[PDB]
Write a protein that holds these residues in place. Structure first.
Motif, PDB file in Angstrom:
ATOM      1  N   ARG A  42       1.268  -1.045  -0.195  1.00 56.06           N
ATOM      2  CA  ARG A  42       0.138   0.159  -0.198  1.00 56.06           C
ATOM      3  C   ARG A  42       0.863   0.986   0.293  1.00 56.06           C
ATOM      4  O   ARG A  42       0.580   1.981  -0.871  1.00 56.06           O
ATOM      5  N   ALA A  43       1.352   1.463   0.753  1.00 55.87           N
ATOM      6  CA  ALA A  43       2.675   2.410   1.132  1.00 55.87           C
ATOM      7  C   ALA A  43       3.677   2.639  -0.358  1.00 55.87           C
ATOM      8  O   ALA A  43       3.506   3.389  -0.612  1.00 55.87           O
ATOM      9  N   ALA A  44       3.869   1.649  -1.423  1.00 55.47           N
ATOM     10  CA  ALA A  44       5.077   1.813  -2.020  1.00 55.47           C
ATOM     11  C   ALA A  44       3.387   2.112  -3.660  1.00 55.47           C
ATOM     12  O   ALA A  44       4.027   2.976  -3.974  1.00 55.47           O
ATOM     13  N   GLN A  45       2.576   1.698  -3.291  1.00 55.20           N
ATOM     14  CA  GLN A  45       1.277   1.832  -4.431  1.00 55.20           C
ATOM     15  C   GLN A  45       1.484   3.313  -4.379  1.00 55.20           C
ATOM     16  O   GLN A  45       0.846   4.825  -5.346  1.00 55.20           O
ATOM     17  N   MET A  46       1.217   3.846  -2.679  1.00 49.31           N
ATOM     18  CA  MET A  46       0.865   5.682  -2.530  1.00 49.31           C
ATOM     19  C   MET A  46       2.240   6.527  -3.122  1.00 49.31           C
ATOM     20  O   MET A  46       1.507   7.495  -3.495  1.00 49.31           O
ATOM     21  N   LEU A  47       3.590   5.967  -2.765  1.00 47.21           N
ATOM     22  CA  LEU A  47       4.725   6.824  -3.410  1.00 47.21           C
ATOM     23  C   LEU A  47       4.808   6.290  -4.799  1.00 47.21           C
ATOM     24  O   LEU A  47       4.738   7.833  -5.148  1.00 47.21           O
ATOM     25  N   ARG A  48       4.182   5.238  -5.533  1.00 51.60           N
ATOM     26  CA  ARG A  48       4.323   5.527  -6.901  1.00 51.60           C
ATOM     27  C   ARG A  48       3.372   6.783  -7.240  1.00 51.60           C
ATOM     28  O   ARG A  48       3.267   7.122  -8.638  1.00 51.60           O
TER      29      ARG A  48
END
Lengths: 72, 69
Positions: A42-48
């Motif tokens: 989820r954090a990786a998707q938010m950063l992307r």
């Protein structure tokens, strides 16, 4: 006409850009909390998403981090 | 079977006594939970029973279902 710093003339308006009636709808926002049940995906998707120009989920996540973490 | 054994109390034969012993052994096995009594053939339905196992505890704060932190 007032001259811009770059040298391009323009017209100066004293009223705020956010005071427009059409913009009043988007001004009111509900501050979601995406820090509940954080997942590395989820954090990786938010950063992307923030990389491409979303800037919303990342902002809410930063707000949650600045209040939830005492040391930070 | 057990009623017929009860009736034949004056003199029981070998087979009647053996059948009664097998029946009571099956009943003890059912009581101990080592075998299921079964269900009625007309429709699949087992008789209702009380809770054999029960535990008690206070509400679980700080669980992973909280999702508040």
């Amino acid at each position: 006409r007032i001259l811009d710093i770059s040298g391009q003339p323009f017209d100066f308006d004293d009223e705020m850009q956010s005071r427009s009636d059409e913009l009043a709808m988007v001004m009111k926002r509900t501050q979601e909390h995406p820090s509940s049940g954080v997942t590395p995906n989820r954090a990786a998707q938010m950063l992307r998403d923030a990389e491409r120009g979303d800037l919303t989920a990342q902002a809410d996540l930063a707000f949650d981090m600045e209040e939830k973490d005492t040391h930070l | 079977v057990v009623a017929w054994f009860y009736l034949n109390e004056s003199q029981p034969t070998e087979q009647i006594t053996a059948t009664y012993r097998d029946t009571v052994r099956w009943l003890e096995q059912v009581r101990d939970g080592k075998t299921d009594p079964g269900v009625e053939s007309r429709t699949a339905a087992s008789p209702e029973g009380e809770d054999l196992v029960q535990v008690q505890s206070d509400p679980p704060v700080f669980s992973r279902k909280q999702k508040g932190f």
